[PDB]
Design a binder for this molecule. Sequence first.
Ligand SMILES: *[C@@H]1O[C@H](CO)[C@@H](O)[C@H](O)[C@H]1NC(C)=O
Ligand SMILES: *[C@@H]1O[C@H](CO)[C@@H](O)[C@H](O)[C@H]1NC(C)=O
Ligand SMILES: [Ca+2]
Length: 220
Amino acid sequence: AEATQACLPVGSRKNGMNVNFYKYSLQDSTTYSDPQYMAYKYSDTKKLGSVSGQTHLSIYYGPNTAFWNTASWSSDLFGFYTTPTNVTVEMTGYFLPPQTGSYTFKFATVDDSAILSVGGSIAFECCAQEQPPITSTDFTINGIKPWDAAAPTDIKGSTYMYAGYYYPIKIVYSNAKALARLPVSVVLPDGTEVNDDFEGYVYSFDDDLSQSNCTIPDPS
Ligand SMILES: *[C@@H]1O[C@H](CO)[C@@H](O)[C@H](O)[C@H]1NC(C)=O
Ligand SMILES: *[C@@H]1O[C@H](CO)[C@@H](O)[C@H](O)[C@H]1NC(C)=O
Ligand SMILES: [Ca+2]
């Protein structure tokens, strides 16, 4: 009734996360403040492309700063050539806890808008990583851009996880202008912190809905 849903896919395990990119308008500071947009409606906009096997989850970009009202192009976002000054990105994969306990994921800051969803039927459905996004607004970290207020600082979300089970994770991040900043980390059950590089923890599987026992609703 209370344990977070996990999965156990049996397909060949791939390292890292899948990252899709989407059209986002320069200086649109309203669309990404809709919870429905950050949850799933981003997928109804123009998909630009995707990269796989991404293990470094943090977003760090700054333009030449001569104009804070023009787009700027770069591959700094996961090796994909786009406009970090204005873009929406969807990262998906499965987080694998090597120990049982509490996992506190964190955004040191959010610039402009971002989300973290953790669990089956929250981030996405088990064995269905690359299917269209589910409608859940049940964010583990809600960093949806707070309208007229300044960027938020050290916002956290905690998930209790059981060892050896794959937990679906989805981050949806958007930027409308200038800097792109989402420094992602997690404090593990033993207390140690993992910044940026999530290699060893995050994995992908090809979709396989024929596998009926993929969903584990109560890992305890
Ligand atoms: C960002 O803005 C520029 C300027 O309008 C536009 O040409 C470009 O397509 C935009 N990029 C994305 C990914 O939406
Ligand atoms: C779930 O079923 C798959 C075969 O479809 C199998 O590989 C896996 O070991 C099963 N898990 C359990 C706990 O029975
Ligand atoms: Ca910005």
